[PDB]
Design an enzyme around this catalytic site. Structure first.
Site, mmCIF file in Angstrom:
data_model
loop_
_atom_site.group_PDB
_atom_site.id
_atom_site.type_symbol
_atom_site.label_atom_id
_atom_site.label_comp_id
_atom_site.label_asym_id
_atom_site.label_seq_id
_atom_site.Cartn_x
_atom_site.Cartn_y
_atom_site.Cartn_z
ATOM 1 N N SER A 155 19.094 -6.002 0.344
ATOM 2 C CA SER A 155 19.297 -6.966 -0.098
ATOM 3 C C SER A 155 18.554 -7.725 -1.127
ATOM 4 O O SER A 155 17.228 -7.487 -0.833
ATOM 5 C CB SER A 155 19.579 -8.357 1.076
ATOM 6 O OG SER A 155 20.470 -7.782 2.031
ATOM 7 N N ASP A 168 10.574 -7.218 5.608
ATOM 8 C CA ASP A 168 9.309 -6.594 5.693
ATOM 9 C C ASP A 168 9.254 -6.247 7.306
ATOM 10 O O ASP A 168 8.489 -6.877 8.170
ATOM 11 C CB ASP A 168 7.987 -7.428 5.200
ATOM 12 C CG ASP A 168 6.798 -6.435 5.505
ATOM 13 O OD1 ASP A 168 7.057 -5.135 5.622
ATOM 14 O OD2 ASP A 168 5.506 -6.939 5.518
ATOM 15 N N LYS A 186 13.294 -0.347 -1.980
ATOM 16 C CA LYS A 186 12.023 -0.157 -1.647
ATOM 17 C C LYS A 186 11.987 1.248 -1.812
ATOM 18 O O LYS A 186 12.381 2.244 -1.162
ATOM 19 C CB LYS A 186 11.930 -0.554 -0.018
ATOM 20 C CG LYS A 186 10.589 -0.913 0.331
ATOM 21 C CD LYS A 186 10.395 -0.731 1.610
ATOM 22 C CE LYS A 186 9.208 -1.436 2.279
ATOM 23 N NZ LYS A 186 9.444 -2.728 2.601
ATOM 24 N N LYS A 238 5.635 -14.739 8.277
ATOM 25 C CA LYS A 238 4.486 -15.462 7.239
ATOM 26 C C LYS A 238 5.667 -16.057 6.185
ATOM 27 O O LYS A 238 6.635 -15.196 5.652
ATOM 28 C CB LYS A 238 3.386 -15.050 6.905
ATOM 29 C CG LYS A 238 3.722 -13.464 6.071
ATOM 30 C CD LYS A 238 2.346 -12.776 5.917
ATOM 31 C CE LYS A 238 2.594 -11.282 5.168
ATOM 32 N NZ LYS A 238 1.565 -10.826 4.650
ATOM 33 N N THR A 241 -1.321 -10.593 9.350
ATOM 34 C CA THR A 241 -2.038 -11.216 8.513
ATOM 35 C C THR A 241 -3.001 -12.406 8.960
ATOM 36 O O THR A 241 -2.509 -13.164 9.952
ATOM 37 C CB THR A 241 -1.084 -11.913 7.411
ATOM 38 O OG1 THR A 241 -0.207 -11.071 6.502
ATOM 39 C CG2 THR A 241 -2.145 -12.885 6.219
ATOM 40 N N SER A 259 0.783 -1.311 0.040
ATOM 41 C CA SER A 259 0.014 -0.032 0.015
ATOM 42 C C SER A 259 0.772 1.409 -0.031
ATOM 43 O O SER A 259 0.479 2.371 -0.584
ATOM 44 C CB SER A 259 -1.103 0.107 1.310
ATOM 45 O OG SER A 259 -1.888 -0.889 1.240
ATOM 46 N N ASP A 263 4.421 -9.895 12.067
ATOM 47 C CA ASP A 263 3.770 -10.345 10.633
ATOM 48 C C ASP A 263 4.473 -11.320 9.948
ATOM 49 O O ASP A 263 4.646 -11.244 8.635
ATOM 50 C CB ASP A 263 3.414 -9.062 9.954
ATOM 51 C CG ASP A 263 2.745 -9.390 8.565
ATOM 52 O OD1 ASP A 263 1.819 -10.631 8.693
ATOM 53 O OD2 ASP A 263 2.541 -8.399 7.791
ATOM 54 N N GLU A 273 5.460 -15.463 2.866
ATOM 55 C CA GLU A 273 5.550 -14.357 2.041
ATOM 56 C C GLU A 273 6.728 -13.352 2.513
ATOM 57 O O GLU A 273 7.464 -12.726 1.475
ATOM 58 C CB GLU A 273 4.289 -13.493 1.963
ATOM 59 C CG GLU A 273 3.152 -14.448 1.285
ATOM 60 C CD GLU A 273 2.475 -15.041 2.481
ATOM 61 O OE1 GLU A 273 2.965 -15.758 3.346
ATOM 62 O OE2 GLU A 273 1.105 -15.077 2.332
ATOM 63 N N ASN A 274 6.933 -13.488 3.778
ATOM 64 C CA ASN A 274 7.900 -12.346 4.420
ATOM 65 C C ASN A 274 9.244 -13.145 4.512
ATOM 66 O O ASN A 274 10.429 -12.590 4.916
ATOM 67 C CB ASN A 274 7.739 -11.770 5.673
ATOM 68 C CG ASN A 274 6.602 -10.725 5.505
ATOM 69 O OD1 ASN A 274 6.246 -9.912 4.510
ATOM 70 N ND2 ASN A 274 5.701 -10.480 6.771
ATOM 71 N N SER A 314 4.358 1.129 -0.391
ATOM 72 C CA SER A 314 5.858 1.160 -1.070
ATOM 73 C C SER A 314 5.706 -0.057 -2.396
ATOM 74 O O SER A 314 4.809 -0.714 -2.252
ATOM 75 C CB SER A 314 6.623 0.345 -0.053
ATOM 76 O OG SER A 314 6.395 -0.794 0.156
#
Ligand SMILES: Nc1n[nH]c2ccccc12
Length: 277
Positions: free
Chosen positions: A88, A151, A39, A135, A164, A20, A133, A137-138, A22
């Site tokens: 990185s 993240d 980022k 997970k 999440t 949202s 957070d 995905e991170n 970045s």
């Protein structure tokens, strides 16, 4: 330190991730030919939405991290409209991608990658920092297939927000308070997910998921590795003070000593060759 870098120092390429507030863009530094993941955050949007404390916190946390299992912040600069964080670059993407690709991990891969995550959390928590957070995905995978956790926008540094849905701990839904044990709850979910292929708590919508969480309403597949199941049962505990790994349980020693990790050598994980997926 060198003279601050700038956009013209880079050849920007593909978008690596979008949030949202970045966008992350792969970029090649011209002088060095090095690939960074930059980022990019828009100042107006951040100020408009009262996110300055979150962006401030993300940078400060990332400055305090010097460990192979975490995304490194190499540099920062800004122009008129935007902030740039040189991060990185994890060539092999998200861990979720591999879970979907191969369906579910076997015991060796599960053991190895869980151990890296445990090792990484031990470091993070040692510095009084909570992710909040965590997970798949991170959890990125480097070129060499070791994890790089990223993240940290939502992270908190120990002396409000909800992560999440599927990885949210009971105490968040019942107190609006989090601690190290929240990450450990998340860890149990991720372990379950490596072995089973899906997260422990699933449902039609976010409300139904939150219901199951606080009811501790989930169960193990028939084939679930017994020692991994026992470990999960000691993490997915509603009372956050009884979660394997937290301070009231005497920390990471007992966790790292769990039979599931019998064959793990904890001291040089980052030096070892990961099992092939
Ligand atoms: N692929 C990536 N390397 N580093 C990142 C940081 C954020 C998002 C994606 C990446």
């Amino acid at each position: 330190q060198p003279r601050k870098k700038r956009p013209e120092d880079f050849k920007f390429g593909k978008i690596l991730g979008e949030g949202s507030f970045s966008t992350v863009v792969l970029a090649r530094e011209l002088a060095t030919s090095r690939e960074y993941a930059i980022k990019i955050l828009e100042k107006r949007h951040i100020i408009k939405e009262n996110k300055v404390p979150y962006v401030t916190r993300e940078r400060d946390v990332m400055s305090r991290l010097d460990h192979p299992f975490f995304v490194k912040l190499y540099f920062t600069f800004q122009d008129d409209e935007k902030l740039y964080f040189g991060l990185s670059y994890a060539k092999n993407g998200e861990l979720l991608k591999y879970i979907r690709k191969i369906g579910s991990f076997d015991e060796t891969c599960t053991r190895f990658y869980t151990a890296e995550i445990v090792s990484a959390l031990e470091y993070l928590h040692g510095k009084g920092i909570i992710h909040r957070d965590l997970k798949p995905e991170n959890i990125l995978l480097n070129e060499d297939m070791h994890i790089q956790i990223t993240d940290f926008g939502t992270a908190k540094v120990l002396s409000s927000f909800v992560g999440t849905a599927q990885y949210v701990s009971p105490e968040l839904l019942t107190e609006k308070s989090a601690c190290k044990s929240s990450d450990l709850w998340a860890l149990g979910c991720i372990i379950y997910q490596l072995v089973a292929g899906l997260p422990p708590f699933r449902a039609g919508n976010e409300y139904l998921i939150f219901q199951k969480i606080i009811k501790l309403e989930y169960d193990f597949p028939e084939k679930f590795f017994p020692k991994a199941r026992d470990l999960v049962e000691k993490l997915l505990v509603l009372d956050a003070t009884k979660r394997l790994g937290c301070e009231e349980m005497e920390g990471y020693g007992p966790l790292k000593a769990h039979p599931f990790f019998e064959s793990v050598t904890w001291e040089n994980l980052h030096q070892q060759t990961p099992p092939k997926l």
